[PDB]
Amino acid sequence: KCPAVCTCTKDNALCENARSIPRTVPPDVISLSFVRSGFTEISEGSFLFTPSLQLLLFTSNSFDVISDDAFIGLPHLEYLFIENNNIKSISRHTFRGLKSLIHLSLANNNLQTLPKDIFKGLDSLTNVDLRGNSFNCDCKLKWLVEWLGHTNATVEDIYCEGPPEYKKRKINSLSSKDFDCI
């Protein structure tokens, strides 16, 4: 049955003010959304009780950590929209196992950095949205500049919000020349 913090149809569940990721979402749902949620963390294997998800949305939440393998066990997931959240930390293997993922959004989360190889193995990606963040253009972001240069995925123009000498520079236009790290 539909969890009380959710509203469900046959195909879809929309959860609001959830205090934890519910483990009782009906296992046949193919799209799941969390809005204004109470939980602060997304630990490994959080969605194993809904293995048939094709779409996941997180919007207007506050997260302390999205952990390694948060989205593991979801081999059919094609759309993952993580937008308009406060997110303190995302991990290197947060998106591990998402071989079918077509479109990832990390838009409007005021992210200051992204860990190296965060998109490793996302071989089905045609779209990634990175706008509306606050990236610091330092050595920790060097990998992203290289990734933007080699990916076939469509990615919008995004801009450094720091350090001050880099502010408003288009990240897509940077080179590894722009970074001399050790």
Numbering used by the authors: 41 to 222
Give sentences from the paper.
For this mapping, we also determined the crystal structure of LGI1 LRR alone at 1.78 Å resolution. Correspondingly, the C42R, C42G, C46R, C46F, C179R, and C200R mutations disrupt intramolecular disulfide bonds in the N- and C-terminal caps of LGI1 LRR, which are common in extracellular and membrane-associated LRR proteins to stabilize their N- and C-terminal edges. However, we suspected that the trimer-of-dimer assembly seems unlikely because LGI1 LRR and LGI1 EPTP–ADAM22 themselves exhibit no obvious structural features suggestive of trimer formation.
LGI1 is a 60-kDa secreted neuronal protein, which consists of the N-terminal leucine-rich repeat (LRR) domain and the C-terminal epitempin-repeat (EPTP) (also known as EAR) domain4. ADAM22 serves as a receptor for LGI1 and is anchored to the excitatory postsynaptic density through PSD-95 scaffold. The LGI1–ADAM22 ligand–receptor interaction plays an essential role in AMPA-type glutamate receptor-mediated synaptic transmission via PSD-9533–35. In this study, we present the crystal structures of LGI1 LRR, LGI1 EPTP–ADAM22, and LGI1–ADAM22 at 1.78, 2.67, and 7.13 Å resolutions, respectively.
